[PDB]
Amino acid sequence: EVFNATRFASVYAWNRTRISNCVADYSVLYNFAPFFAFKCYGVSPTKL
């Protein structure tokens, strides 16, 4: 529900959503976007 939206807000008003009380399996995050840059700093996708 965060990746397939239609009106990702502009950078001047960056909409923020809170993710909690669920189980995260980022394979859906992987397959829902043709990734161009997954530059992470404090964490890594292989074990996310």
């Binding site: 992987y30 890594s44 292989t46």
Partner: protein, 49 residues
């Protein structure tokens, strides 16, 4: 050309433009994790044209 290599391995594979950026020592993606993963201590280079 100032180097003496014991053995040279020459793998070739045709692949997309962004997966050219994907292939690197220790990367991730649909290809870097399920098709061709390079070693983290990779002593060698890749060529793309």
């Amino acid at each position: 050309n100032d180097l003496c290599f014991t053995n040279v391995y020459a793998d070739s594979f045709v692949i997309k433009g962004n997966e050219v950026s994907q292939i690197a020592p220790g990367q991730t993606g649909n290809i870097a994790d399920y098709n061709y993963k390079l070693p983290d201590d990779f002593t060698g280079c890749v060529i793309a044209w």
